[PDB]
Amino acid sequence: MNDSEFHRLADQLWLTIEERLDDWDGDSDIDCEINGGVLTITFENGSKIIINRQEPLHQVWLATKQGGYHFDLKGDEWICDRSGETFWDLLEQAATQQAGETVSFR
């Protein structure tokens, strides 16, 4: 992947995360903030999910209460290098776990 294409794709993903999280209207209090370009999602139990760019690698990285996951773009989706699982599946599973409430954007 090119640097420019990474900036394009990562900017799109950032917007989609920010909108989905800022639009959240479930029972739980969930906050998303952007600091130094890094997105942090915080939950009521004090846990967090952190999403950042690894620009020289053209990867997006995800840190949850349960682990870390590094993503490359494969056929129009961000895919976890280790497991093959998608970014949105992993993010929704972790947010649902950490909120104690379904967090779904399908």
For the chain, the domains span 1-106
d(CA 67, CA 57): 20
User: Which residues make beta-bridge pairs with 80?
Assistant: 71
Contacts of 97-102 with C-beta under 8 Å, sequence gap 24+, read 97/64, 97/65, 97/66, 98/43, 98/45, 98/47, 98/48, 98/49, 98/64, 98/65, 99/26, 99/28, 99/30, 99/43, 99/44, 100/28, 100/45, 101/26, 101/27, 101/28, 102/26
User: What residues contact 43, with CB distance under 8 A and at least 6 apart?
Assistant: 28, 29, 30, 95, 98, 99
